[PDB]
Amino acid sequence: SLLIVVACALLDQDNRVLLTQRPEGKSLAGLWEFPGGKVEQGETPEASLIRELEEELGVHVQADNLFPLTFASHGYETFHLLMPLYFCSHYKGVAQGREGQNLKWIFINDLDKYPMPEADKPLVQVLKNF
Ligand SMILES: [Mg+2]
C-alpha cells in the first residue's frame, strides 16, 4: 500500500549532485534520478540508503553523514510513494555504475535541465534553495 523509498543527493567538492540513469537495454534511454532504493524489513532508512549506495555505486557512507533534507509524497494507481531525500557531502569511494547504469554529476542549479521522474522533481526545487 505505502512504499517507502529512500534517496540521496551526493554532493562533490564542486557542489554537483549525482544523478543516475538506467541503461537503455532493449529499448530507449530512461530518466535521470537520485540514487536510492526500497527500505527493507529490519533496516533503518539510513541502513537501506547506505547499502543502496554501496551496491549501486561503490560509494561508502556513514549514517552520521546522511542529513534529512525533504521528502516526496506521490500517489500512483496501485500504491502510495513516500520518499525521504537525504544529502551527503562526506563519503568514501569513487562513484562508478556497478549495475551498468549511467552517471552524471550536475551542478545543483542545473538539475531541472534534465528529464527526471515526476516524483523526483519537487525535490530538485528544495535543493536549489538550500
Ligand atoms: Mg538498488
Author numbering: 27 to 156
Question: Which of the paper's sentences describe this entry?
Answer:
The genome of B. henselae contains genes for two putative Nudix hydrolases, BH02020 and BH01640 (KEGG). Nudix proteins play an important role in regulating the intracellular concentration of nucleotide cofactors and signaling molecules. The amino-acid sequence of BH02020 is similar to that of the prototypical member of the Nudix superfamily, Escherichia coli MutT, a protein that is best known for its ability to neutralize the promutagenic compound 7,8-dihydro-8-oxoguanosine triphos­phate. Detailed features of the Nudix fold, a mixed β-sheet sandwiched between the catalytic α-helix of the Nudix box and a second α-helix, confer the substrate specificity of Nudix hydrolases.
The crystal structure includes two molecules of Bh-MutT, A and B, packed together in the asymmetric unit. At the C-terminus, electron density was missing for the last two residues of subunit A and the last residue of subunit B. The structure of each molecule in the asymmetric unit was similar; the Cα atoms of residues Ser6–Phe135 of the two subunits superposed with a root-mean-square deviation (r.m.s.d.) of 0.61 Å. Bh-MutT eluted from a Superdex75 size-exclusion column with a retention time of 68 min, a value that is more consistent with a 36 kDa dimer than an 18 kDa monomer (21-residue N-­terminal tag present). The α-helix of the highly conserved Nudix box in Bh-MutT is one of two helices that sandwich a four-stranded mixed β-sheet with the central two β-strands parallel to each other. As observed in other Nudix structures, all of the polar conserved residues in the α-helix of Bh-MutT are orientated on the same side and are opposite the central mixed β-sheet. A small hydrophobic pocket formed by the side chains of Leu58 and Val64 is likely to play a conserved role in stabilizing the loop–helix–loop Nudix motif. The structure was determined in the metal-bound form, with the catalytically essential divalent cation Mg2+ observed to be co­ordinated to the side chains of Glu57 and Glu61. The similar three-dimensional orientations of the conserved residues in the Nudix box of all known Nudix protein structures suggest that these residues play similar roles in all Nudix hydrolases, binding one or more divalent cations. This is true for Bh-MutT, as shown in the electron-density map in Fig. 4(b), in which the hydroxyl groups of Glu57 and Glu61 are near the Mg2+ ion at distances of 2.10 and 2.11 Å, respectively, which are within the expected Mg2+-coordination distance range. A gradual increase in ellipticity at 220 nm was observed for Bh-MutT up to ∼323 K, followed by a more rapid increase in ellipticity that leveled off at ∼335 K. Visual inspection of the sample after heating to 353 K showed evidence of precipitation, indicating that the unfolding was irreversible, and consequently the CD data could not be analyzed thermodynamically.
